[PDB]
């Protein structure tokens, strides 16, 4: 009865999609995420999982502002200028 | 214009079940 019989009672979910990390680990009762600790300001990450870090690091996403900072760097972040016109 | 086939995935089953119902007690 601890097995196939009591696998039917599973109908109300514990977690939902966290809004900070988009993973299905937001404990609805504890009101905190198990993947990033969303209500806490600091993203949670431990060294004892060398691999769970490589899934969420500055390279894993779009870097929509870093891939441009890395380009504006090759010229000391010049500003307010344009090439000489034709 | 060469048409194409199809493809459907499915979870890979892992064999780990062990009933271990049989008992041979002989002290």
């Amino acid at each position: 009865t601890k097995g196939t019989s009591s696998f039917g009672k599973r109908r109300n979910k514990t977690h939902t999609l966290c809004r900070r990390c988009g993973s299905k680990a937001y404990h609805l009762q504890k009101s905190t995420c198990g993947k990033c600790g969303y209500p806490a300001k600091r993203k949670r990450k431990y060294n004892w999982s060398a691999k769970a870090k490589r899934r969420n690091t500055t390279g894993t996403g779009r870097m929509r502002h870093l891939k441009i900072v890395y380009r504006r760097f090759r010229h000391g972040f010049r500003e307010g200028t344009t090439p000489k016109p034709k | 214009f060469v048409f194409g086939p199809t493809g459907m995935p499915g979870p890979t089953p892992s064999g780990t079940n062990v009933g271990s119902s049989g008992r041979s007690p002989s002290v």
């Binding site: 900072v69 972040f77 500003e79 307010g80 | -």
Partner: protein, 122 residues
């Protein structure tokens, strides 16, 4: 007619917003032609008009921003958009004058004991 960004810079704000409000109607009529079924000559003009609208709104925002940073050209406080945006640590430095500042004790040491240029005989 090929709408280039060069001949858009002399026109006036309302002579630009009338072109915008005409291109958006040409879009609406093309997104309608797409669903009613139209010739590819029309369907392919969507990429042409979406980019004509892009060129127009680009010249509008560029002239408006140039006018803004001219209006605040000599003022002390200006909008955080017109303030020079570099890296946070590069904006939180010391000025070139605070860097180039010296105490009266070191403006006196540098003066009384300058680094002399010399050589030695071998």
């Amino acid at each position: 007619a090929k709408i280039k960004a060069r001949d858009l810079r002399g026109k006036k704000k309302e002579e630009l917003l009338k072109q915008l409000d005409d291109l958006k109607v040409e879009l609406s009529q093309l997104r309608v032609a797409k669903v009613t079924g139209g010739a590819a000559s029309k369907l392919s003009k969507i990429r042409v008009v979406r980019k004509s609208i892009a060129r127009v709104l680009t010249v509008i925002n560029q002239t408006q921003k140039e006018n803004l940073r001219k209006f605040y050209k000599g003022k002390k406080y200006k909008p955080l958009d017109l303030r020079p945006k570099k890296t946070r640590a590069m904006r939180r430095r010391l000025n070139k004058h605070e860097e180039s500042l010296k105490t009266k004790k070191q403006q006196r040491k540098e003066r009384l004991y300058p680094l002399r240029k010399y050589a030695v005989k071998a």
